[PDB]
């Protein structure tokens, strides 16, 4: 019970017998779609650290345990001996397929521990490796390509105004890490004023999107060029020609200023291409500057009664005193209707998340931070994300297809800083 080392996913998982969400659960993540072959008992070639030699050589290792990008390896020949089991990023540079060492002409050197556990190594490896699963062809090329992102620095995009949700303003991509963009407002009012978001964030749009859709924008008064519109994530097309959302319709929505809560909300504006301006009752400026933009297909908006039927705490209007809050009484007092349930119809993906699974999650209240996290609840496609060590008051509601969730090891793979559990 005396831990005298820093944080590592490996020891964290082994010690408490944790389970990590596989890379498969993250479509946006690198190798998220080319991961079907990676599994336990898959053999690879990795450097042999069990060598007194001053140089470096390789050996065969099998995957004992797979946690996100991180794989627990055991050198071939140890069998059940876990004495030299070591963790690694399976997408790491030193991990190769099995043909790679000899077809390139380097000798496989057995670990010093089992050098005399078997006499004939040619016969040994032939019996062990014949018909064994390994890494897919051009796998290292796959990994390399996954680390190459179409969003380049100096690209201009439109993004929501952090301090004025109702309008967008032009930001510039200054740096890209693991598909995550550090955006800087073109007309900053703060020295390090940034906007961390993913490439395929629904919050960023091409130049001219605000004007085209009817969304408010900040009018402005260096090598920067406009992002090719074909790079942005595609929005699901809808048919708003018939029955559709109307101004005044009541609903439930995740507060963009507090992603820990789902709030009583109202449709304030119906825009083009499916987009809607939504306000939270009790927290609306008279000029409508607090109106946020959710698409009609957004997983962050819910029909009236969603929270109650699924046993989720609903945040009543600020200042509202008739507790506990009842939608029926509120619809009478405010003389309004609920947005029809049929408008919220959406597919519920087989995401593969399970309660208790570990992952790397963006702090949505501070997008700079990416922290060790856990899935504590699952409401169809709605996930309750908990940050290990911290108070559950700050658990955030996150969609299962969110690009702000990442597999275990994503930080190490992409070179992004990972926050460890609170002390």
């Amino acid at each position: 019970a005396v831990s005298m080392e820093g944080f590592s996913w490996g020891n964290y998982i082994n010690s408490n017998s944790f389970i990590a969400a596989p890379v498969t659960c993250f479509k946006h993540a690198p190798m998220g779609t080319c991961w079907g072959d990676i599994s336990e008992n898959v053999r690879v070639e990795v450097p042999n650290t069990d060598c007194s030699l001053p140089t470096k050589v390789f050996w065969i290792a099998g995957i004992v345990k797979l946690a996100g990008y991180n794989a627990l390896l055991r050198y071939e020949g140890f069998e059940n001996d876990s004495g030299l089991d070591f963790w690694c990023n399976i997408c790491g540079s030193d991990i190769h397929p099995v043909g790679w060492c000899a077809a390139s002409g380097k000798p496989l050197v057995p670990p010093r521990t089992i050098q005399h556990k078997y006499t004939n190594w040619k016969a040994f490896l032939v019996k062990r490796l014949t018909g064994a699963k390994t890494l897919p062809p051009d796998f290292s090329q796959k990994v390399s390509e996954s680390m190459q992102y179409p969003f380049k620095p100096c690209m201009r995009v439109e993004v929501v105004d952090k301090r004025h949700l109702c309008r967008t303003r032009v930001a510039v991509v200054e740096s890209v890490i693991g598909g995550r963009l550090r955006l800087v407002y073109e007309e900053s009012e703060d020295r390090t004023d940034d906007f961390w978001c993913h490439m395929h964030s629904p919050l960023i749009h091409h130049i001219g999107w605000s004007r085209s859709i009817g969304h408010r924008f900040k009018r402005s008064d260096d090598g920067h060029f406009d992002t090719p519109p074909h790079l942005f994530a595609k929005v699901k097309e809808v048919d708003q020609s018939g029955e559709w959302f109307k101004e005044g319709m009541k609903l439930e929505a995740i507060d963009p200023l507090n992603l820990s809560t789902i709030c009583v909300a109202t449709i304030r504006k119906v825009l083009a291409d499916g987009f809607l301006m939504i306000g939270i009752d009790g927290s609306e400026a008279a000029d409508g500057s607090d109106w946020f933009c959710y698409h009609a297909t957004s997983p962050s908006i819910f029909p009236v009664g969603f929270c109650e039927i699924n046993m989720i705490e609903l945040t009543p209007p600020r200042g509202y005193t008739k507790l506990p809050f009842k939608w029926f009484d509120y619809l009478r007092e405010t003389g309004s209707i609920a947005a029809p349930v049929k408008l919220f119809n959406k597919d519920v993906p087989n995401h593969g998340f399970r309660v208790g699974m570990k992952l790397e999650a963006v702090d949505l209240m501070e997008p700079r931070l990416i922290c060790v996290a856990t899935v504590t609840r699952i409401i169809h496609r709605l996930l309750r994300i908990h940050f290990d060590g911290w108070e559950e008051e700050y658990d955030q509601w996150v969609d299962c297809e969110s690009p702000d969730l990442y597999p275990v090891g994503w930080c190490q793979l992409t070179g992004y800083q990972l926050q460890p559990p609170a002390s």
């Binding site: 072959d37 053999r43 397929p97 099995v98 043909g99 060492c101 000899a102 077809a103 002409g105 380097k106 000798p107 496989l108 050197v109 057995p110 190594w121 040619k122 490896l125 032939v126 490796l129 014949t130 018909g131 064994a132 699963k133 390994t134 890494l135 897919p136 062809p137 796998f139």
Partner: peptide
């Protein structure tokens, strides 16, 4: 897919 994987320490045949 299966291929003939090279081993130096001859060849072995494995699935990728």
């Amino acid at each position: 897919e299966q291929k003939q994987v090279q081993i130096k320490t001859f060849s072995v045949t494995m699935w990728s």
